[PDB]
């Protein structure tokens, strides 16, 4: 039966979009980190610690989406 | 939703409350406030006149 081709398409939509959100959201957040280490280089280990606190939130919803896309393709399909 | 004559009856209700509010409600209320504002200003003028 044909049905199994749509399950690769559904993981493709789910995992590509979470690659848009996890890449641009760290790009925006990460550039402001660099700007603050260019102007204020006495702060780099603290800003780099705070960057890891806020970066953990940014990719969480993308990490669920990438885990379900791998489950759909390998486990279900 | 339902296109309805309520639009016309409510336009009578709206106009009649603006005519009665315009004549009766609003001139007497603004009279009472502004008359109090004048009393406060006449209090200011009275203090200056005392020290003069």
């Amino acid at each position: 039966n044909l049905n199994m081709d749509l399950l690769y398409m559904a993981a493709a939509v789910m995992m590509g979009l979470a690659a848009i959100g996890a890449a641009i959201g760290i790009g925006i957040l990460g550039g402001k980190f660099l700007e603050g280490a260019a102007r204020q280089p006495d702060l780099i280990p603290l800003l780099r610690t705070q960057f890891f606190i806020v970066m953990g939130l940014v990719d969480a919803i993308p990490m669920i989406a990438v885990g379900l896309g791998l489950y759909v393709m390998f486990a279900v399909a | 939703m339902n296109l309805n004559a309520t639009i016309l009856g409510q336009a009578i209700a709206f106009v009649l409350f603006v005519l009665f509010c315009m004549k009766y409600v609003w001139p007497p209320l603004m009279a009472a406030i502004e008359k109090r504002q004048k009393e406060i200003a006449d209090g200011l003028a009275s203090a200056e006149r005392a020290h003069k």
Partner: protein, 266 residues
């Protein structure tokens, strides 16, 4: 009582109507088809809320003292001062209409929105069981016809002020000549300034309706879908939010009325 949750949502979204032919209290099982079927609930609650506005303010205006006001009188002059201060900000002409028009729009549309906060079944239950009327919904501004009735009312004031304070000579120049100026662009400008004219009252009614109709639909859905033990955790956070909506939507209909009537003439 075989209320399915879909049927409960159904009957609540059906106003009570009366035909100018039969004079008959229709019910949600079958809707008749004609224009002349006034929505009984909206007229009665609207005038009742508009009467209560006028009875409160007249019971103070007939007595108001320029001494120190009483604790009720002070609540009324706070709203008078708020309305007068916002008119004074955005209107300089001499007209005796704009200030009381702005007052009645603010306090009436606020009182109409206030109905949405009451428990969704309280008044509709009493009307079916105690009275026997086939249907009810109790928020007047959650129905289009009254919100367009006020928005067309403001439209006719926009035309009266634009004709009166600048004459058909000036009003025909602004309609044709702007925004592109040259007489070569006149055929286009009557569409753009005509649709911009027409959009001003169309935005007034549909801004107020869309807020208030979809607000009541949320209270119908939480009551219709979720089991009683669980409703309060989705109903309580929405009512606290909709106290902010009911005030600002009343305030925006006031403000944009003043702005449209004020920028019409000057």
């Amino acid at each position: 009582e075989n209320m399915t949750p879909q049927d409960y949502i159904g009957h609540h979204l059906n106003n009570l109507q009366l035909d100018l032919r039969t004079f008959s209290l229709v019910d949600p099982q079958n809707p008749p088809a004609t224009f002349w079927t006034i929505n009984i609930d909206s007229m009665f609650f609207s005038v009742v809320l508009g009467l209560l506005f006028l009875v409160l303010f007249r019971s103070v205006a007939k007595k108001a003292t320029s001494g120190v006001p009483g604790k009720f009188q002070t609540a009324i002059e706070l709203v008078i001062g708020f309305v007068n201060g916002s008119v004074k900000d955005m209107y300089h002409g001499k007209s005796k209409l704009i200030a009381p028009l702005a007052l009645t729009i603010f306090v009436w549309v606020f009182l109409m929105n206030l109905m949405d906060l009451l428990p969704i079944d309280l008044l509709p239950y009493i009307a079916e069981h105690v009275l026997g009327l086939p249907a009810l919904r109790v928020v007047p501004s959650a129905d289009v016809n009254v919100t367009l009735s006020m928005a067309l009312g403001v439209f006719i004031l926009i035309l009266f002020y634009s004709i009166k304070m600048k004459g058909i000579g000036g009003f025909t120049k602004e309609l044709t000549l702007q925004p592109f100026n040259h007489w070569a662009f006149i055929p286009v400008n009557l569409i753009l300034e005509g649709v911009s004219l027409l959009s001003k009252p169309v935005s007034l009614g549909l801004r107020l309706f869309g807020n208030m109709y979809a607000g009541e639909l949320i209270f119908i859905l939480i009551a219709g879908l979720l089991p009683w033990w669980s409703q309060w955790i989705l109903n309580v956070p929405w009512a606290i939010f909709h106290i902010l909506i009911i005030t600002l939507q009343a305030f925006i209909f006031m403000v944009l009325t003043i702005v449209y009537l004020s920028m019409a003439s000057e």
